């Protein structure tokens, strides 16, 4: 119907006008008087070996002790960072995997792959506790809400929430135009956001199940997302070299991190414990660290040959780990 599409445009124009009216001053101008962090130099403290093929993603443990890594060969290996010694090596039925997560209590580990099934493993007993099925597209990310509920994202536009015992979709979130390839959880369990193949990245409410906001700053595919430690802002890294920091209380974006030299995409984004430093990977053989307050570069992390596809920061914030398409890991401090 002709009228329906227009009604839609008028609403978009009103939203844009409201966002423009809410704008008062540039975010960069506010933090002009902040003293710069300066040069930050960190070196590799440990090197982890034992993987055969390219790795995809990893997740630090709730304690700063352990971490879990997954690779395309089809094995989950739980390292011990302090003594660089393996603990478990769980084979998988399907070789291709694209995500992993580590339970808050430390009693469960989950891994989802290109096969349309999310499976959970029990550490203390290993065997497959339950198999979660129902999606129509390949999985992209998954996180543990608690010991009982897990929220996942799929290649189809749907994002769902499961229950381990029942094994059924308690709630389904729909509205995305294309494929979803990112997800993160707030410090509390109330809210979570996602970034899809379309430039739009929205915010979802777990209990309500209704979308609350929509951000469309970027102009290409979105490949990473994370929350500010406060919980009132989130930063995004897209296929274009630009990295942008959105806001929740005010819909419009605040600052953009980009440079002329960089022409490669971003595959992972994470924040420091204090939130001052924004650490982002790159398609090139490098990992760059920025300053969140004034968009000034700090340092360069090098020592990877193939790519950088995973990144995470420990809860206490003492160490940062990076992954690669090479078989090797790396721990920085």
């Amino acid at each position: 119907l002709d009228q329906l599409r227009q009604e839609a445009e008028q609403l978009k124009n009103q939203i844009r006008d409201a966002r423009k009216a809410c704008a008062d001053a540039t975010l960069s101008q506010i933090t002009n008087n902040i003293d710069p962090v300066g040069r930050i130099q960190m070196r590799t403290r440990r090197t982890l070996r034992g993987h055969l093929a390219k790795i995809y993603a990893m997740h630090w443990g709730t304690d700063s002790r352990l971490l879990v890594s997954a690779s395309q060969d089809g094995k989950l290996i739980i390292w011990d960072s302090y003594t660089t010694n393996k603990v478990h090596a769980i084979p998988l039925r399907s070789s291709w995997v694209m995500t992993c997560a580590y339970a808050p209590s430390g009693n469960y580990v989950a891994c989802g792959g290109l096969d349309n099934i999310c499976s959970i493993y029990n550490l203390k007993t290993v065997r497959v506790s339950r198999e979660l099925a129902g999606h129509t597209g390949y999985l992209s990310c998954c996180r543990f809400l608690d010991d009982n509920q897990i929220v996942t994202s799929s290649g189809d536009t749907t994002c769902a929430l499961w229950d381990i015992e029942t094994g059924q979709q308690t709630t389904t979130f729909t509205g995305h135009t294309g494929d979803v390839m990112s997800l993160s959880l707030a410090p509390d369990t109330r809210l979570f956001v996602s970034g899809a193949c379309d430039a739009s990245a929205k915010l979802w409410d777990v209990r309500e199940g209704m979308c609350r906001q929509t951000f469309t700053g970027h102009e290409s595919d979105i490949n990473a997302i994370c929350f500010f430690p406060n919980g009132n802002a989130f930063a995004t890294g897209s296929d274009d070299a630009t990295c942008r920091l959105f806001d929740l209380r005010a819909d419009q974006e605040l600052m953009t991190y980009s440079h002329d030299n960089i022409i490669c995409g971003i595959t992972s984004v994470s924040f420091s414990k204090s939130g001052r430093l924004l650490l982002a990977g790159y398609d090139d053989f490098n990992c760059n660290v920025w300053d969140a307050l004034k968009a000034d570069r700090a340092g360069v992390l090098a020592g990877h040959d193939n790519r950088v596809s995973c990144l995470g920061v420990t809860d206490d914030g003492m160490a940062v780990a990076t992954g690669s398409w090479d078989s090797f890991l790396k721990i920085w401090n």
Partner: protein, 229 residues
């Protein structure tokens, strides 16, 4: 303390021994990706394959050489291509008889797939099914009626025809291959090659053909590695 350290050391040791042991098993096998357009006829081709021994995986071994396939079930931009940059070869199936009903669509995928930044060093083993049906349509829907570049491609200069019911069908056979090979030659520095084959609905030496193609690909890769080509 020391006993705890001892225990961790012993576990690392068992895990490492088993991981080294499977390293040889992992390195021995060869991986193939199978991709094709709709209604091409890949299910029939997999039949002789299962005879040798969301994602369907096939394991078959010939002459003490292990092969393992990956059929992915699907007009969508694909972000799972990056995950398939380590396969030895890609099997591509195109229905030659399906011109009146889509061929332009298949070629459209081939350039798309031929120019990815992640599949630069991967060669393609190309099959052409529905051979029998092609002869019947040419011998009323003609290529000239549907395609405007049909002129002048009827005869192959190096044509080595099998005894043929139709000199004319031999004209339709080599027009499609020339269109497919026109894209393969244009991009890449010789790191990747195309292997065209002609196969009817009933065929038996498919395993032999794929074995020979894989051997040729590996020999070419090793020759280029040591700077002899």
């Amino acid at each position: 303390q020391r006993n705890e350290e001892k225990a961790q050391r012993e576990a690392n040791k068992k895990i490492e021994k088993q991981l080294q042991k499977d390293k040889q098993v992992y390195r021995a096998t060869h991986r193939l990706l199978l991709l094709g357009a709709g209604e091409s006829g890949k299910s029939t081709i997999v039949k002789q394959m299962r005879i040798l021994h969301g994602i369907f995986e096939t394991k078959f071994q010939v002459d003490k050489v292990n092969f393992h396939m990956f059929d992915v079930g699907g007009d969508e931009r694909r972000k799972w291509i990056q995950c398939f940059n380590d396969v030895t070869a890609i099997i591509f199936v195109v229905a030659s008889s399906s011109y009146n009903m889509r061929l332009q669509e298949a070629l459209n995928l081939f350039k798309s797939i031929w120019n990815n930044r992640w599949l630069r060093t991967i060669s393609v083993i190309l099959f052409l099914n529905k051979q029998d049906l092609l002869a019947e349509k040419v011998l009323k829907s003609k290529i000239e009626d549907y395609f405007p570049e049909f002129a002048r491609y009827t005869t192959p200069e190096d044509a080595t025809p099998e005894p043929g019911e139709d000199p004319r069908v031999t004209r339709a056979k080599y027009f499609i291959r020339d269109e497919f090979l026109r894209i393969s030659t244009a991009s890449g520095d010789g790191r990747h090659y195309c292997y065209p084959h002609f196969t009817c609905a009933v065929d038996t030496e498919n395993i032999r053909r794929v074995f020979n193609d894989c051997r040729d690909i590996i020999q070419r890769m090793h020759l280029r590695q040591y700077e002899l080509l």
